[PDB]
Amino acid sequence: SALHWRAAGAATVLLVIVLLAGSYLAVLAERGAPGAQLITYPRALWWACETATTVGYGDLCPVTLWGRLVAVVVMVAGITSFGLVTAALATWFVGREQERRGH
């Protein structure tokens, strides 16, 4: 269990937490604003998934400051997580390419 597989695994777990908490915080922030469609938990969870994966169909979109602020956190946490995995996959491939040589 090296670092790159530990961080990537921890990123996946953290991403799940952000998706769940993001759904809760989105509804809590979007309600009270007339015209907002992100006001129920199940679809807010679906919105979080297509937000963290960047994607963004447009069927659901935050219209409040805190609702959009939550979205930004979801985006970054999504991009970083899916990006931390790629960096982990590279370290795996690089470390094995040395084994196909003299290291």
Epitope: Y24, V27, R31, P34, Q37, T40, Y41, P42
Partner: antibody, heavy 118, light 108 residues
Framework: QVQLQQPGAELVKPGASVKLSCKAS????????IHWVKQRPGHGLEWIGE????????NYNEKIQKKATLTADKSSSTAFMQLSSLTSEDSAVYYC???????????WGAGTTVTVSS | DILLTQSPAILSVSPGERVSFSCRAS??????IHWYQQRTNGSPRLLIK???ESISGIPSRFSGSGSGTDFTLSINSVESEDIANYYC?????????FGSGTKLEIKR
């Protein structure tokens, strides 16, 4: 079991105030929203406002005159609606309902018949 | 705010006949509409959630359909205990709104 409990009636004279209660039972999640619905005799349902006991945040209907204050109490699982400075137009039956956060009102209360007179 | 129009206000029907209630939204709300029932001096009771999804406890007599702006609550062969006020409620955009209501009466 009766999930939502409300007082039978509340008599208020114009200018005064009243604090209705909505003691809830059954499954109490963290995503539960307590709504309040006003219904005048002969008329239909009217959404007053909503509140989430978990966070304490409350939203209200903006199209009508705002004279309601929603507070909660997680210790006793009871929602409270504070009506201030009422007139004859505010005399109606006030229902409270529980929403699981999925849009619809699963269960309603018996409703509190608030009468405004001297 | 989304406006929900229920027409007609009073719906008269013979016993054992199929009756359909109407609910029209001022804008497309998908299937985020919900039907309720309120008898004389009673509390509203959920009949149909999300346009067509049925509720446990509610008789199979009730059914729902529609998508977008037009929705319909139907009762296959209406009986005496179905005499009440029927309201529709949307949950697509904040705030939640109700319909004007529709009175059902039986011509015995």
């Amino acid at each position: 079991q009766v999930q939502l409990q409300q007082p039978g009636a509340e008599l208020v004279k114009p200018g005064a105030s009243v604090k209705l209660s909505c003691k809830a039972s059954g499954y109490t999640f963290t995503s539960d929203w307590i709504h309040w619905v006003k219904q005048r005799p002969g008329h239909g349902l009217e959404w007053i406002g909503e509140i989430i006991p978990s966070y304490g945040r409350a939203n209200y209907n903006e199209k009508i005159q705002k004279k309601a204050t929603l507070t909660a109490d997680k210790s006793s699982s009871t929602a409270f609606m504070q009506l201030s400075s009422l007139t004859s137009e505010d005399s109606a039956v006030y229902y409270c309902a529980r929403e699981r956060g999925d849009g619809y009102f699963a269960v309603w209360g018996a409703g509190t018949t608030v009468t405004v007179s001297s | 705010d989304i406006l929900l129009t229920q027409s007609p206000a009073i719906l008269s029907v013979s016993p054992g006949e199929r009756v359909s209630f109407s609910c029209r939204a001022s804008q497309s709300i998908g299937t985020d509409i919900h039907w309720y029932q309120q008898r004389t001096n009673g509390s509203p009771r959920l009949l149909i959630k999300y346009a067509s999804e049925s509720i446990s406890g509610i008789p199979s007599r009730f059914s729902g359909s529609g998508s977008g702006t037009d929705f319909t609550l139907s009762i296959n062969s209406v009986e005496s205990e179905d005499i009440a006020n029927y309201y529709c409620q949307q949950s697509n955009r904040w705030p939640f709104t109700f319909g004007s209501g529709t009175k059902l009466e039986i011509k015995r």
